[PDB]
Amino acid sequence: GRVIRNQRKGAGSIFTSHTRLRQGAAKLRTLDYAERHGYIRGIVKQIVHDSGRGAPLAKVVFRDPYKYRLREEIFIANEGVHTGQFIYAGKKASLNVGNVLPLGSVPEGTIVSNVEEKPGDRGALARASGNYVIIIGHNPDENKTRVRLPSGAKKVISSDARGVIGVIAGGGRVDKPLLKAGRAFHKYRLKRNSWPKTRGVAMNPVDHPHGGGNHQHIGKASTISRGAVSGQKAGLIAARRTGLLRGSQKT
Amino acid sequence: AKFLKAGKVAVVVRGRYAGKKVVIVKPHDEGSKSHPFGHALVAGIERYPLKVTKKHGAKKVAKRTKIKPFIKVVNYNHLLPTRYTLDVEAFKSVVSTETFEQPSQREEAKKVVKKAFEERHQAGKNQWFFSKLRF
């Protein structure tokens, strides 16, 4: 055969991301002395739209503590913040929506977002619209905090990792149908070249493992092994179950 | 009660002297034929003195403490009253409603106001009045 499409996507020629209208990378402020010991105050100047991203962005400007200068950071907007608002960041910040606190300074049940996985990587977890992380316990010895992630899984983080109080704006986005191929076109136009999708059963055997034969079919089962060799991984990759997750078809 | 009296310090809010401090000399709650609104004849400073340390010699000390005054008629709506005061009786008979015509008389009033403000800036009175408002 020939090289198939999911193999072809890794050389990254026409499959790279479309990043022209994007505002910049959205990450937290760099951890330093002021956030490590006290707090610092900035002000949010504008809330803007970012191309290829469901959640809006916030432009929070702070002061440089070693030079007479201003520093502007790009945050992801939590639901409720507005222009002209003060944002406090650091160890001694108060528990208000929009503030940036370490995870060892929040009580149980607190709703945080844009959470660092390691202390100092400036935001990794719960960054899409409508998502959040729930604090579900602490460990004062061993300096660890237990969290629940948006997928349902549980994780244990160092208490020096930071997070922003609140839920990320833009929720309820997928509750609307698209209704139109043109709407899907204009959606993926600002992300990457991955739409439309031809089915593998509609190709020839040179192009795909599922291609060929009269009466379009997959000849064998579609569950692949985990140790397949990268031209074979087409289907359901390492599935532990199949079915409906609902068992009733109607609720 | 009625607090906008002579000797009360205010801040000019708009009109080329915005941000400058001001002493009220003569109030007019009713307003004349000209200026039919409630207004006040005031005196203030356009050029503030600069900071002075131990390092400056006597000539540069004398240069860095000059004061440039102004006199003005200003609406009550364009003033903002403070809680500080000042003693206004030095230049009290020189600022009148006939002074604001015949600009030789305005020069003559400005000289008296300049002398009195420099005398009070000496001997350390009213540092709030002789400091700048940063905005």
């Binding site: 002395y33 440089d64 030079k67 007479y68 | 800036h121 350390g124």
Partner: peptide, 29 residues
């Protein structure tokens, strides 16, 4: 003398710009 006025700075943790200190412990040699 009385034209000079003392005004001590608040080098704080969020108040003023920090002064120049001896950073010889943190030089990238």
């Amino acid at each position: 003398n009385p034209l000079t006025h003392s005004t001590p700075k608040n080098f704080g943790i969020g108040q003023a710009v920090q002064p120049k200190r001896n950073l010889s412990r943190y030089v990238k040699w």
